[PDB]
Scaffold this active site. Structure first.
Site, PDB file in Angstrom:
ATOM      1  CB  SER A  97     -11.837 -67.107  54.266  1.00 38.47           C
ATOM      2  OG  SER A  97     -13.271 -67.326  54.445  1.00 38.47           O
ATOM      3  CG  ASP A 239     -10.646 -72.330  55.287  1.00 38.68           C
ATOM      4  OD1 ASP A 239     -11.751 -72.302  55.318  1.00 38.68           O
ATOM      5  OD2 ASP A 239      -9.998 -71.795  56.472  1.00 38.68           O
ATOM      6  CG  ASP A 241     -12.294 -73.280  58.692  1.00 40.65           C
ATOM      7  OD1 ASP A 241     -13.044 -72.888  57.841  1.00 40.65           O
ATOM      8  OD2 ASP A 241     -11.642 -72.617  59.332  1.00 40.65           O
TER       9      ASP A 241
HETATM   10 CA   LIG Z   1     -13.190 -71.405  56.398  1.00 37.62          CA
END
Ligand SMILES: [Ca+2]
Ligand SMILES: O=P(O)(O)OC[C@H]1O[C@H](O)[C@H](O)[C@@H](O)[C@@H]1O
Length: 448
Positions: A97, A239, A241
């Site tokens: 992250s 990442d 998301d």
């Molecule tokens: Ca993330």
């Protein structure tokens, strides 16, 4: 003691004292014992050490007789998607992250990409790893490389009617994480003109670790939007998301308002659906969901609670103000790609700018933004707040910390489940002055 890397939602720690290849291999062995039947999907982010950690996971899984499906460098949502799509027993995303350069981590899921969290397998894995002194076995199962993204890309594109899309000019800012790879795979199928900022994956992060919430990073997207006359800008974490939106003025849109906006966009396609939301900021989402003919469903924050609530409710969409957006058709999982496709479609179809899509909502339900407090005594501090407001007799709800509704304003005050912090959110009914005075009042009490 216990291994510190095992957190409530995932594994995260400094390499190599808190997480390393030996621990990663043992995690693979332990995960094999926790899953129902099937292969395990493995993917990793752009961090320099992520492939080696994935390889160690693979070695442990295969020594335990699990076939491994290596989907390679990817976003976290691709591990979710492929785990569900391929009917795998589970999946692991190796991702750090926005933790420091010497950190890494893992997010683990079981069948249908259902989360594995502290109380749903993760601490069981931790405890097995902690006691495991066995010699490493050799692989008794195979690894296959599966880098075909066709089904994933088709799934993303299914959320929009491509013939209705207009050739919007969109700034995209991967922050040198992995999002640009997917943008570039989608671009041949879309009419948009992309302005690519910090686009190339680079785990050395020459432009900063990907975190669009940090002002210096935020400003890079805002500047590109303004300088290029873009319709809007999108930035992602590493990442991808999490997605973050900037209107045509360069203004960053607080994530709260994206929940209601996305809910309305989804409810146009799936009428009458349920929408799951968190308790931090609520009034705008409840109203927008109801106005669009949906049913809002209050849920404790945190992706595992959101996803299981969505499953139990057949909810079409769930959203947190913390830039997490979950979609029933996407294995109930979060995606940082689906949201901007939906917003681009909404701008294309409506003729309205992103700014105008949110402006009145932001005026109607102004919010403090999330304000974090590290205090000496969180419990005493929360008690000081509640004692101060007791004479007003707010309506109290304990879904996630304390929510107090005073009529024209409300707050949520809760301990974070990922950091040792208190998090405060305040909103009011169209009253910026009340928002500020109450926010400052609570802040003073918390720091007292
Ligand atoms: Ca993330
Ligand atoms: O506010 P916190 O308890 O720290 O959680 C903040 C976020 O942590 C992770 O990112 C979870 O996936 C999110 O669902 C959650 O909202």
């Amino acid at each position: 003691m216990t291994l510190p890397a095992f957190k409530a939602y995932d594994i995260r720690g400094r390499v190599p004292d808190e997480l390393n290849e030996d621990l990663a291999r043992r995690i693979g062995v332990a995960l094999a014992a926790q899953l129902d039947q099937g292969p395990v999907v493995l993917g990793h982010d752009v961090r320099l050490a992520s492939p080696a950690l994935q390889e160690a996971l693979s070695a442990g899984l295969r020594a335990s007789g699990r076939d491994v499906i290596d989907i390679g460098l990817c976003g976290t949502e691709e591990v979710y998607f492929q785990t569900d799509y391929l009917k795998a027993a589970g999946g692991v995303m190796v991702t750090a992250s926005h933790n420091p350069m010497d950190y890494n981590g893992m997010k683990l899921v079981r069948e249908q990409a259902r989360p594995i969290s502290s109380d749903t397998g993760l601490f069981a894995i931790r405890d097995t790893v902690a006691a495991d002194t066995a010699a490493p076995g050799e692989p008794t199962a195979s690894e296959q490389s599966r880098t075909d993204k066709t089904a994933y890309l088709e799934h993303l594109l299914s959320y929009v009617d491509r013939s209705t899309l207009k050739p919007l000019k969109l700034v995209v800012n991967a922050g040198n994480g992995g999002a640009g790879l997917i943008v570039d795979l989608l671009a041949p199928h879309l009419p948009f003109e992309f302005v690519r900022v910090f686009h190339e994956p680079d785990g050395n992060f020459p432009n900063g670790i990907p975190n669009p919430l940090l002002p210096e990073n935020r400003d890079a997207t805002a500047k590109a939007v303004k300088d290029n006359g873009a319709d809007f800008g999108i930035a992602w974490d590493g990442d991808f998301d999490r997605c973050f939106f900037f209107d045509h003025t360069g203004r960053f849109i607080e994530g709260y308002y994206l929940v209601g906006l996305l809910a309305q966009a989804i409810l146009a396609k799936q009428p009458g659906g349920k929408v799951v939301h968190d308790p931090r900021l609520t009034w705008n989402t409840v109203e927008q969901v109801e106005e669009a003919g949906g049913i809002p469903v209050l849920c404790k924050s945190g992706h595992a609670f959101i996803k299981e609530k969505m499953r139990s409710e057949n909810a079409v969409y769930g959203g947190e103000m913390s830039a997490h957006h979950y979609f029933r058709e996407f294995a109930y999982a979060d995606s940082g790609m689906i949201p901007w496709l939906l917003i681009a479609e909404l701008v294309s179809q409506s003729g309205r700018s992103l700014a105008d899509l949110v402006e009145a909502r932001m005026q109607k339900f102004p919010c403090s933004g999330e304000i974090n407090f590290k205090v000496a005594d969180a419990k005493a501090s929360v008690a000081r707040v509640m004692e101060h407001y007791a004479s007003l007799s707010p309506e109290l709800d304990y879904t996630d910390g304390i929510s107090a509704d005073f009529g024209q304003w409300r707050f949520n005050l809760r301990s974070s489940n990922t950091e040792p912090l208190l998090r405060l959110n305040v909103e009011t009914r169209g009253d910026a002055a009340l928002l500020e005075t109450r926010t400052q009042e609570i802040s003073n009490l918390l720091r007292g």
